[PDB]
């Protein structure tokens, strides 16, 4: 009825005409864009991150786009535009490889955690013979949406979805849930989940999170310290995420002078410990950041930063602004069986 | 007699100071070695322990400096 | 539609060859998946008082070779494994290797011998394990060393409500004094030291005595230990009577800090080397697959000792004077 209210549409994907005709047809594996690929994206995200992401509204034939351009909308507001080179597919291959078979490469780094190497799409069987995986431009859209939903956790974890997952949990763990909701109010619990998924910490393993809450919230009602204790009880997931299956984890470290000047950050005069810190140092550390970083390749994940226990979150809150692709952890969030390889000396 | 007390208390503080800097250096050199997380957690806990002993020695030194200054103002 | 999914507790990934092996029956004709895993669960429950969940088997892992295996804790892999092809794991005496090596987990034997030799080992009174039985042993070591994540509050509730079927007024008396979270914490503090909680009755009687008076969880755990004299003595003396330095005891009076809700190890750090240096030069190596010897402490300092020495020698049991039967007989 045109005389009611309407609910805000979360995520809209506009296409120009050529992509809208391209999503008509089946792929090599015969799959539909709308009926197979998007749901499989959602399920894979749910296995990766503990988040139920909403379904996607795709509108064809945008007035505002060329035919090989696409746009993504947050809450009926466009968020970022994209382009696709015509008749090219995106696979991350080293410049060495891009010239070791004599194929074209077009450098176009479309978003930040995505490959930057476009090769003419007639070369597909060549890349299959060379055992190089390539992505359909539709699969490129899928990858860019996935990067969105990783980077845009914050806007989709509000209180009603937290309630929905807690009420799913009640079916199995009702007295645990009742203890948790005696200890933690629902808004503050949602805040804890948000501050977890800030650093790409999955909350798929709800059981361990709830157990750690029911331990630690016996005493402490600050949301952020409880988030820290949840991290320090997710040692196993953090170690598997960042040490990538090895005997060892290869991280960066701080300088202890930096650690002992981030004891400067204390703000006991205010309720929260907001940042009381020499303004120049936001360059002064950060220069030594920029000359230290290894550029990870685009399909993997960045090098890790290992900090002292109490200053992990302040480091992450500082360095997300330019480098959202840093995971900050501290000593308590890894297994004390792992050997840590000291290979940054950042002063 | 209060200068001798001051020497006593400053020696008793300086032994703790030397131990605390030894613990800091051992922290730093086991960071440089590539030890495990067990080692660093345990040494940080023991540093948090010996911080209180260092602070008690500092407070005793401050009390003894009070008394020596009072005896000088005699 | 889409919904939520529950975290799967224990997933066992298999390579192709093991996945073909688990189709067929074993030497005594009983099944890996339908008999041996349930029998492992039943034996674990009989030994320690813990209801472990059923086991999620995926065959044909892309990421493992065919005689390789992987174990997942909450859909996060915990340790990878290997099996030498066509070998069975039989602890030998090393000289045997020339009268007739892979240490897999730290409580598994290190001697793989080619599997054709079965009648030799049966005649020679040598116990052998199927590689399936080796998987069973490594899973058992997992669940011993990973008890803590399977004794949570809802399982404690389930066992309490099983108890209510028989001892409901005992249960109500216990839960009037003690919240369920603190009871689960007591159970965790018990099963940290591999103290079984199968015998719920004696634990509940000790609780209903002592929790009139004491509301600290840790003293109540100590009193449950001191009421499980019989179980501790039978575990540790192996049915015998007789199979530590005062200076350390008189320096652990140093550890009195109780200003906050808990206690605090308040000790000159260097003693963590003073115990350990003498510790390694005192220990008897008990035969691989046996029971390490047992450490006797003063009554109020038992937990501090166990918390201290677990880090390098996790499989050595600290007890104190009150926790043995009162009739059983280096620094």
Author numbering:
A (entry chain E): 362 to 708
B (entry chain O): 33 to 106
C (entry chain D): 363 to 462, 468 to 610, 615 to 700, 707 to 708
Quote the paper:
The export apparatus is composed of a central, nonameric, ring-shaped inner membrane protein, termed the export gate (CdsV in Chlamydia species and SctV in universal nomenclature). The export gate does not directly engage the sorting complex, but is linked to the ATPase by SctO, an ~140 Å coiled-coil that is structurally similar to the central stalk proteins of the rotary ATPases- the F1-ATPase γ-subunit and the V1-ATPase D subunit. In T3SS, SctO is the key link between the export gate and the ATPase and is poised to transmit mechanical force between the ATPase and the export gate. Presented in this manuscript are structures of the C-terminal region of the export gate from Chlamydia pneumoniae (CdsV), both in an unliganded form and when bound to residues 25–110 of the Chlamydial SctO (CdsO).
The CdsO protein was truncated to residues 25–110 to facilitate crystallization of the complex. Most notably, we observed CdsO25-110 positioned within a large cleft at the interface between two CdsVC protomers, specifically, between subdomain 4 of adjacent subunits (the SD4-4 cleft). In our crystals, a 1:1 stoichiometry between CdsVC and CdsO25-110 is observed, and saturation of CdsVC in this way likely aided crystallization. CdsO25-110 binding is mediated largely through electrostatic interactions and stabilized by the buried surface area of each face of the CdsO25-110 coiled-coil with one side of the CdsVC monomer. The average total interaction area of one CdsO25-110 with a CdsVC dimer is ~900 Å2. Large-scale architectural rearrangements were not observed in CdsVC upon binding CdsO25-110; instead, small conformational differences were identified primarily within subdomain 4. Helices 12 and 13 of CdsVC, connected by an extended loop, were displaced by an average of 3.9 Å and 9.5° when bound to CdsO25-110, which draws subdomain 4 further into the SD4-4 cleft to stabilize CdsO25-110. The SD2-4 cleft is smaller, with helix 3 moving, on average, 5 Å toward subdomain 4, and the sheet formed by β-strands 8 and 11, adjusting by an average of 2.3 and 2.5 Å, respectively. β-strand 11 binds the loop connecting each helix of the CdsO25-110 coiled-coil; interestingly, this interface is mediated by H-bonds between backbone atoms of CdsVC and CdsO25-110. The CdsVC: CdsO25-110 complex has a Kd of 28 ± 3 μM, whereas the L638A/D639A mutant does not appear to bind CdsO. First, the structure reveals that CdsO binds in an inter-subunit cleft between subdomain 4 of adjacent protomers, rather than in the central pore of CdsV.
